[PDB]
């Protein structure tokens with residue numbers, strides 16, 4: 492295994508997309524996590540410059556803040572498959588269950604179910620096998636953010652469920668495991684399991700304190716959810732053939 | 736030596752600030768590269784959470800797009816020293832010459848003179864040695880951006896000088912060396928020397944073509960330069 496890894500940012504929605512590839516493999520097979528429609532051309536230009544073969548375009552969950560790039564990526568690289576959890580209820584080429592593994596050459600990602608922000612959230616974690624990246628890397632979606640977590644008042648979320656998911660599926664990973672979230676609003680880019688267990692002001696509270704604090708934040712209505720969720724439930728696809 | 740490394744982003748100016756610390760030393764000594772005034776409180780809070788001792792607040796160059804956080808950091812944390820090139824002509828606690836080293840515990844950076852965007856630009860490269868980061872990391876300021884570079888028509892810059900700086904100081908490093916620029920406007924965060932030598936749209940041309948390309952750019956007047964340069968020449972104070 493030889494990992495090529497890039498974190499990419501979409502400034503309108505503050506979203507991180509992740510590119511992973513096994514560049515030891517003759518085809519340089521690659522995947523994207525949480526690609527955004529707006530940045531598809533950027534992403535494809537980068538994949539071409541680096542000579543990668545994009546196998547999968549995956550989502551951690553159904554996004555409320557942007558439109559998935561997975562559909563457009565399919566319109567543009569025939570052969571790429573979209574991937575999302577079965578639990579999300581969304582359309583995709585491939586559905587994931589907890590415990591599934593996704594492979595790109597010799598590199599693999601384990602799928603952990605981490606619902607709470609939505610019912611469909613998963614966390615992708617690089618494999619624990621002997622030849623895999625060290626430290627492990629966890630792509631936590633909106634379940635754990637750096638020094639925070641996603642809201643739980645829409646998309647069938649639950650604070651109780653989020654707390655249990657994080658403590659059972661993420662904080663059980665080795666402390667040096669890197670945390671790569673789907674969003675960040677403070678200019679931060681990475682954390683670690685150990686660092687979040689020490690410093691995350693949400694998820695280091697006891698369960699009932701976390702639930703109380705969450706319930707009272709008085710967050711505004713999500714500005715894009717009425718557009719983004721329907722679009723993302725159909726893989727970001729259109730119902731008319733593309734023009735031009 | 737054990738390197739703790741973070742890249743931090745300031746959205747108003749699209750600036751990257753870099754935190755480096757040697758967490759194997761009993762003080763957990765740290766430095767910041769290109770800190771911004773707006774994000775001083777954030778940077779201090781992170782430094783406090785991680786239990787680090789801020790030693791240096793350094794600039795790659797005199798910034799035209801934001802006001803340096805060096806002066807505010809020195810105010811809040813007496814004892815912190817600001818650092819900048821001697822060639823920049825700006826005020827700082829410590830001036831650097833080409834070939835100088837800056838150390839925090841067992842971690843050190845080499846200073847390479849890379850003027851062209853400005854007369855004072857330097858690139859900080861993590862040091863050579865088995866106890867240093869592998870691959871090496873080059874903090875290139877605005878001399879080399881990911882698939883780009885800064886403009887050369889202000890701050891006593893020069894396209895010819897920028898080309899020579901990049902080719903002699905940056906493209907001579909091992910190809911796997913990481914490039915961490917001071918800004919990005921496309922959502923990219925890192926590149927490598929080998930990638931830029933292959934794919935940088937302007938710096939891969941020959942010198943005269945590079946010069947011609949840079950002269951032909953259609954750019955607006957720098958939006959902050961008459962506030963930022965004066966402030967940054969006096970350490971933000």
Ligand SMILES: [Fe+2]
Pocket residue numbers: 552553554555556608633641
């Ligand atoms: Fe979300």
Ligand SMILES: [Fe+2]
Pocket residue numbers: 796797798799800852877885
């Ligand atoms: Fe600059």
